[PDB]
Homo-oligomer: A and B are copies of this chain.
């Protein structure tokens, strides 16, 4: 009766407005006095590095986040966030989860550690936005960029310096100067949250077509929920995912074409091919670490092979 939840999202305040608040506001309107979810933004109740354990322990009831930034202690953590070159398209994320087995794997992994994986979804592609233009691979060398831990470990091979700072602190460090840029998002977020005002260039070669994140709930709180509220929560979370699917699909194209705050640059395809090749090596290193990681890597490899065989509009030649 009149359940009180607190949810903390990975998103900063200006971003939470678009990626979590609408669905939480809708849930609250529908649920009324039965249940209310208070939404907190990046690092607000607890820092990122404490977020997973805060939810596990029950201090925070729910989380919207990728696995990677919060360093969940699971075998699938390295696949959340921006797994290099994993998904070309945002719709690949719900398909992988619902049709190629990733939902059952995430559920088992998180249940082991006292957490309910409610649902996964796609967000945006991962692009470099920077103060200085990137026109070759060597231009990546030395760059301090805000990114995710696993994508950052991959990017380090090209001389990139992956920096993690709290999200709310980024804008200024771009304006100057502990950061040279960002590899945390695509162009829709860049314009929306103000990062485009303090960077100058946008590299069109992404290192992922779609971020993977999720809604999680403390398992005890999850099993306490009445059926009707559990279903309501699940449906509002899917609505949140659906909204992001079209928000990003529309935003990336429109802002690339009509945005005047970032100048587009590109690295030639022949040159960028080295990055893609390196990512396959990186996948193999991950697969070697455990049987679960090997299983997931094989699913990504198989899926991408099947896209090539399916052809248009999944893949073109």
Identify the A interface with B (CB < 8 A): 26, 29-30, 32, 88-92, 94-95, 98-99, 204, 209, 227-228, 231-232, 235-236, 238-239, 241-243, 245-246, 249-250, 252-254, 256-258, 306-307, 309-314, 316
Contacts and interface: CB of A to CB of B under 8 A. Distances in A.
Contacts of A235: 26, 30, 235-236, 239
Contacts of A241: 242
A238 B209 CA distance: 23
B257 A310 contact: yes
B89 A228 contact: no
A292 to B, nearest CB: 22
Contacts of A243: 238
A316 B313 CA distance: 10
Nearest to A236: B235
A135 to B, nearest CB: 16
A244 to B, nearest CB: 10
Contacts of A257: 306, 309-310
A313 B88 contact: yes
16 contacts: A26-B235, A29-B231, A89-B313, A94-B245, A94-B246, A95-B250, A98-B250, A99-B250, A238-B239, A239-B239, A242-B245, A253-B310, A253-B314, A257-B306, A257-B310, A316-B316
Contacts of A238: 238-239, 242-243
A110 to B, nearest CB: 21
Most buried by B among A32, A250, A316: A250
Q: Chain A's interface: helix, strand, loop or mixed, by majority?
A: helix
Contacts of A88: 313
A82 to B, nearest CB: 15
How many identical chains are in the complex? 2
A186 B80 CA distance: 32
Nearest to A232: B30
Given A91-B91, A312-B204, A99 B242 contact: no
A116 to B, nearest CB: 18
B91 A227 contact: no
A310 B232 CA distance: 37
Contacts of A245: 91, 94, 242, 245
A256 B313 CA distance: 12
A258 to B, nearest CB: 8
Most buried by B among A32, A250, A257, A313: A313
A209 B29 contact: no
B231 A30 contact: yes
A234 to B, nearest CB: 9
Contacts of A26: 231, 235
Contacts of A252: 310
A74 B7 CA distance: 44
A204 B311 contact: yes
Nearest to A27: B235
A253 B209 contact: no
Contacts of A311: 204, 256
